[PDB]
Amino acid sequence: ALYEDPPDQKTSPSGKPATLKICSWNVDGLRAWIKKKGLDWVKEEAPDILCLQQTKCSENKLPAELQELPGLSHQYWSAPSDKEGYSGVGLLSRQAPLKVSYGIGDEEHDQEGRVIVAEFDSFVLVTAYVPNAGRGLVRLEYRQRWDEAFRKFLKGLASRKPLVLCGNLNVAHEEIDLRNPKGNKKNAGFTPQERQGFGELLQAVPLADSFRHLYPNTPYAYTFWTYMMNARSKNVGWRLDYFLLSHSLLPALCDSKIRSKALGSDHCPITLYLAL
DNA sequence: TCGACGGATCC
DNA sequence: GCTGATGCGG
DNA sequence: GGATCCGTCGAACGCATCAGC
């Protein structure tokens, strides 16, 4: 079925106005995304922080348009060590962070440009492009090792400051999180291994799935659709892009959105409103 | 994702 | 720059 | 033996690299 995201709630559970708007977008090709007008949409969304995944663009090749952003002038990027048109993330912020770091501090998992950590006054923001398990599940063994190192890293982070994690986590947690769960139980993104790890991630850190916390029974809300088979026109998709929050931020949570109608990738953007 | 393939298994 | 083939992705 | 179940098998879309020139 087709999905309509409800209007933005911009007041917190205590009536306080949202002060921080974070948008996250797996652009799947930063340069093509910009050519497909992605930055225009960004300028109208006007986030305070913009997190990008699957940029597929080395630092040298960053399009000129990106410095034309004066509302997101503090920009951080991470590309793979050696694979050239692969993976990649970026973090653009209105205000300068206190401290920015790349990767999770584990050599094996910090070579594919997947993680940026940005520390702000009252929280830490992580954006991540989690490794796909791969066609025929060839990288599933590696993915399970990623899941554990990433969980352990995030647990340490969240022990020192409240944590926001966003981006393409490359799993649909539960059957409500994709249109065809039955046919996908042996495909990347919906293996029991990947689903288990996501559950362990929520419990171990701990983290809450912002969108599920507010809309725990809302079906057909997805963030990705294959380019093939006209999937997006039929809303045959997966919810792969999340905002995961420390529990102590839940009273700061105003809304967690899915921007279904913004085009330019095979993912749509998602947006978090917090009252900090 | 989808429909074409098998190879069982059924009124 | 242009073709044609390969890597990758849920 | 002619339908109807199943689990496989394959090739689409899009971006970006690579090889070669």
Side-chain angles (χ1 to χ4, degrees):
Chain A
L2 267 46
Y3 173 79
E4 180 136 285
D5 214 27
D8 299 359
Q9 161 76 266
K10 306 193 186 171
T11 78
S12 83
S14 61
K16 295 179 203 308
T19 61
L20 178 69
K21 179 170 179 172
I22 305 181
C23 177
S24 182
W25 203 348
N26 188 111
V27 295
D28 206 349
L30 181 64
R31 287 164 285 184
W33 172 73
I34 291 175
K35 291 170 171 144
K36 290 173 288 180
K37 305 305 181 175
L39 274 184
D40 296 341
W41 185 91
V42 168
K43 292 182 282 208
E44 196 204 323
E45 183 77 340
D48 293 307
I49 304 175
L50 169 75
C51 298
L52 304 179
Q53 307 85 34
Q54 211 175 5
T55 48
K56 294 180 176 201
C57 189
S58 69
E59 173 113 18
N60 171 278
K61 293 163 186 168
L62 291 176
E65 290 102 321
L66 281 164
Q67 208 228 58
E68 198 168 310
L69 313 196
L72 299 168
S73 72
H74 304 90
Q75 309 183 358
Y76 310 91
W77 311 91
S78 177
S81 178
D82 262 343
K83 309 176 179 180
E84 180 73 11
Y86 179 72
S87 187
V89 293
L91 192 151
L92 296 76
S93 185
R94 178 173 65 77
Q95 315 187 50
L98 305 181
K99 181 179 172 62
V100 165
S101 42
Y102 301 101
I104 73 188
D106 191 334
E107 252 308 284
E108 190 197 355
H109 305 298
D110 293 349
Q111 296 298 282
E112 299 182 349
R114 294 185 173 284
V115 169
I116 298 183
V117 185
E119 174 169 359
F120 295 90
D121 273 333
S122 55
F123 69 102
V124 59
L125 174 64
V126 181
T127 199
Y129 171 43
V130 162
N132 184 291
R135 287 259 179 119
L137 304 183
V138 50
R139 220 141 101 101
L140 180 56
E141 183 180 5
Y142 168 73
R143 163 57 172 278
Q144 296 171 72
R145 310 186 53 231
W146 162 277
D147 276 358
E148 173 186 340
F150 192 43
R151 169 205 322 147
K152 182 174 139 182
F153 171 66
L154 292 168
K155 186 188 190 185
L157 259 195
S159 84
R160 308 187 285 271
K161 221 168 202 175
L163 169 68
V164 182
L165 168 69
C166 69
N168 174 359
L169 310 187
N170 244 327
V171 46
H173 183 195
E174 289 301 342
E175 292 197 9
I176 192 165
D177 290 309
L178 75 178
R179 176 55 176 87
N180 305 308
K182 306 307 185 48
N184 278 307
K185 283 207 182 51
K186 299 162 275 292
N187 292 344
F190 204 57
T191 72
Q193 292 86 328
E194 291 169 287
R195 297 171 66 182
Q196 277 149 21
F198 187 88
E200 291 157 357
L201 172 77
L202 301 184
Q203 174 221 307
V205 174
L207 293 162
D209 176 343
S210 57
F211 176 85
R212 271 302 159 223
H213 173 70
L214 298 177
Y215 312 101
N217 300 112
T218 304
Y220 311 122
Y222 313 129
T223 65
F224 162 80
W225 315 255
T226 187
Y227 278 130
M228 291 131 274
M229 293 320 301
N230 314 76
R232 188 160 181 177
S233 59
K234 310 138 128 181
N235 193 30
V236 181
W238 311 42
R239 199 173 65 101
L240 306 177
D241 305 86
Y242 300 74
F243 285 104
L244 305 194
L245 306 185
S246 294
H247 285 48
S248 61
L249 292 172
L250 291 181
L253 173 59
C254 296
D255 207 344
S256 177
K257 317 307 294 173
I258 298 166
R259 302 304 199 201
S260 319
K261 292 197 280 264
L263 312 154
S265 175
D266 47 2
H267 301 235
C268 76
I270 54 174
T271 292
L272 185 81
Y273 287 96
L274 296 179
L276 284 181

